[PDB]
Amino acid sequence: LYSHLNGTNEEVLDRMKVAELCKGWSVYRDASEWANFKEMFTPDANIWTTWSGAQTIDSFIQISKDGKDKGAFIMHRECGTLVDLNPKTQRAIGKMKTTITQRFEYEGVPFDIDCDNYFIFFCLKDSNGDWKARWYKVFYVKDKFVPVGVPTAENMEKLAKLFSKENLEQYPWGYQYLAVAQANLGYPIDKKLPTWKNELYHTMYDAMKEWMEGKEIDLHW
Amino acid sequence: LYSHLNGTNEEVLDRMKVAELCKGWSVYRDASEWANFKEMFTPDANIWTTWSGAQTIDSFIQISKDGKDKGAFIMHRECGTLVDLNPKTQRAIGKMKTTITQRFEYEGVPFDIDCDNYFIFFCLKDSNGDWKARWYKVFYVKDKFVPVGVPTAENMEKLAKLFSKENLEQYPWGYQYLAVAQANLGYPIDKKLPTWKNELYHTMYDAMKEWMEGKEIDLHW
Amino acid sequence: LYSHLNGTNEEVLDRMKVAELCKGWSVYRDASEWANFKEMFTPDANIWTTWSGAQTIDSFIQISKDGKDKGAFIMHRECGTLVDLNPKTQRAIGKMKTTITQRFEYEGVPFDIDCDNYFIFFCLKDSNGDWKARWYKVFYVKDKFVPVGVPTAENMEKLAKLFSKENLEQYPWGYQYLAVAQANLGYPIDKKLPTWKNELYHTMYDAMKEWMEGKEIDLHW
Ligand SMILES: O=[N+]([O-])c1ccc(O)c(O)c1
Ligand SMILES: O=[N+]([O-])c1ccc(O)c(O)c1
Ligand SMILES: O=[N+]([O-])c1ccc(O)c(O)c1
Ligand SMILES: [Co+2]
Ligand SMILES: [Co+2]
Ligand SMILES: [Co+2]
Ligand SMILES: [K+]
């Protein structure tokens, strides 16, 4: 019995504010607006990504800065955002569909990997009446290899060596291409993230329900 | 003389609520949140899609469930949503740009078809003061074949047999690739949907004007 | 010390109205809703694009109409929009991530170029209390060639002649593919637009700061 469509004017405005917060990932992180990014989160927020695994908000900002300085090139396309709001507990879940789009190079050939997903922001209204995210985790739905230059036969033969069936199969279906490409860059890959095929899908939805009820959770699996 | 930018605070809030409703297609349908999806619609709403043709909201939910259980894999990326509002008649048109992105397989090779379009939601404010969509139909703008794995020469030769010029030309320009791929799955294809090239473009815009004036319409062509 | 998340109800509503304004580019321009498009702008607004260079809002509308009549086919996918608001000066910056997606043909082979970017709208609240954009310019981040039909070896060999390394290198990294394709259509290309690699990145952020302080600017570089 959450608020998510229509509702009172105050409910609408709360859902607008939570929706903006989520979109800050796409707008602020891609642009390295790190103070604006940090404002989305509680001081003790925890984040998970494929390439970082579990992090605090502050540790995630530091390691992201480090990666960008080394040439990591990740962008997000926001693809539809709505909010489930519980006005009684001052809790909300922001559901922000995105494509993660990361630019890579192998043997001189540029390419993207594009991964469609849901970013899930576990939000609360704090002592100042401000919405903030305490937890962030992602459901990874599907991904693909994306040519950047004209995909001539010779360049695609080289890239096919990296995206072998054996390499893709090491990772959960939903982020296999992204994981292969990030691991080739040297990142550790968190293989215990939710998809739309594995069992962590259900652990995620259970944590979302408990959050909305006002309970404490812990996504450290 | 619709309300669509600026306006009074109540107009802004109405346009926010209608915009959220439209986005429910991308957020709720992709995630099989069927109760949240149904809440977007009047009880007697009618829907059209390429693969379903004309449906009621309830029949569409049932056949979508059936297709997902059989492995149909359709997602949406929301690409820009605004609202035309007539406060005098309590009517609105939600205009939600999207990409329909459906995952397919042919002779063991995965691929997507991505179709850019406008989703048009014909909305009214009901007896409870809630916005709901009574009619939904789409303008199909352009589409493309999307490789998923590295597009090596041999895999693309097999797929080229399915996307022959003769097969594409059976369908309205704007959704030809999507129609070929869905028909190969066994779906009937509705060939009488609006594009940006055919004459139904104008029938659509006429129905939108009459809806905003408070009149009854019927999209059953 | 801008307003961009949370804030007062009036601040939220101002940011909602500015966000809608920006999205009008994607919704209205693609659909040739030219009166709705013009409403986004002050009467004396100035616009820059890769294919038009500097224009007034009225001159841009005329030349866009001309190009569409000749078959130019540009669409936008909106990819995340937020607003920086200064309530003291009645000034705002709308930051709208997009993909510019333009459909082309070379030697009988269709293709898209997709360019990820930030659209920046320099907005003010006018005498009627309405938000309007006085300046519009873009940060071009990355781009790619996009096959439309199945990318068989023979069709990609022809297209590779157009997207030679020497041709791409004529343009700023961030919009090189888009520039090559638009120049092949006969458009002049503005090579002095901001990217995430060139020095105009900093001139842009400086103009945004001065705008928010209530000062006059001039993007005519
Ligand atoms: O913000 N990013 O860079 C992200 C977020 C989630 C991911 O799984 C990822 O690979 C990158
Ligand atoms: O919701 N979907 O699955 C849709 C909606 C419209 C379409 O034309 C379609 O092919 C699929
Ligand atoms: O509106 N458009 O057509 C645009 C806007 C910016 C661009 O740089 C462009 O190439 C096209
Ligand atoms: Co701030
Ligand atoms: Co509900
Ligand atoms: Co108007
Ligand atoms: K979007």
Numbering used by the authors:
A (entry chain A), B (entry chain A), C (entry chain A): 11 to 231
Question: How do the authors describe this structure?
Answer:
AGDC1 and PPP2 fit in none of these categories as both enzymes neither display cofactors bound to their active sites nor require the styrene motif or ATP hydrolysis. Instead, they act on the carboxyl-group directly attached to the aromatic ring. Intriguingly, these enzymes’ catalytic mechanism is a new type of decarboxylation mechanism combining acid–base catalysis by a His-Asp dyad with a sophisticated web of hydrogen bonds and a double tryptophan twisting clamp. The trimers of AGDC1 and PPP2 in the crystal structures represent the functional biological unit, evidenced by the size exclusion chromatography data and the extensive intermonomer buried surfaces and interactions.
AGDC1 4NC/Co2+-complex had only one molecule in the AU in the space group P321, like the PPP2 crystal structures. The substrate binds in a deep cleft within the β-barrel. In the 4NC/Co2+ complex, the cobalt binding sites link the N-terminal regions of adjacent protomers. R39 anchors 4NC in the active site through an interaction with the negatively charged nitro-group, and the hydroxyl groups of 4NC form hydrogen bonds with Q192, T60, and Y150. H86 points to the si-face of the ligand and interacts with D40, forming a catalytic dyad. The nitro-group of 4NC is rotated by ~ 24° with respect to the catechol ring through interactions of the oxygen atoms with the nitrogen-hydrogens of two conserved tryptophan residues, W35 and W61, which create a tryptophan-clamp. The cobalt binding site in the crystal structure was identified by anomalous X-ray scattering. The cobalt ion is octahedrally coordinated by E49 and H14, each from a different monomer, located at the N-termini of neighboring chains, and four water molecules. To investigate the interactions between AGDC1 and its native substrate, we docked gallic acid into the active site of the 4NC/Co2+-complex structure using an induced fit procedure. Here, the gallate’s binding mode was virtually identical to that of 4NC. However, the additional hydroxyl-group present in gallate forms hydrogen-bonds with two more residues: Y146 and Y150, while Y146 does not interact with 4NC in the crystal structure.
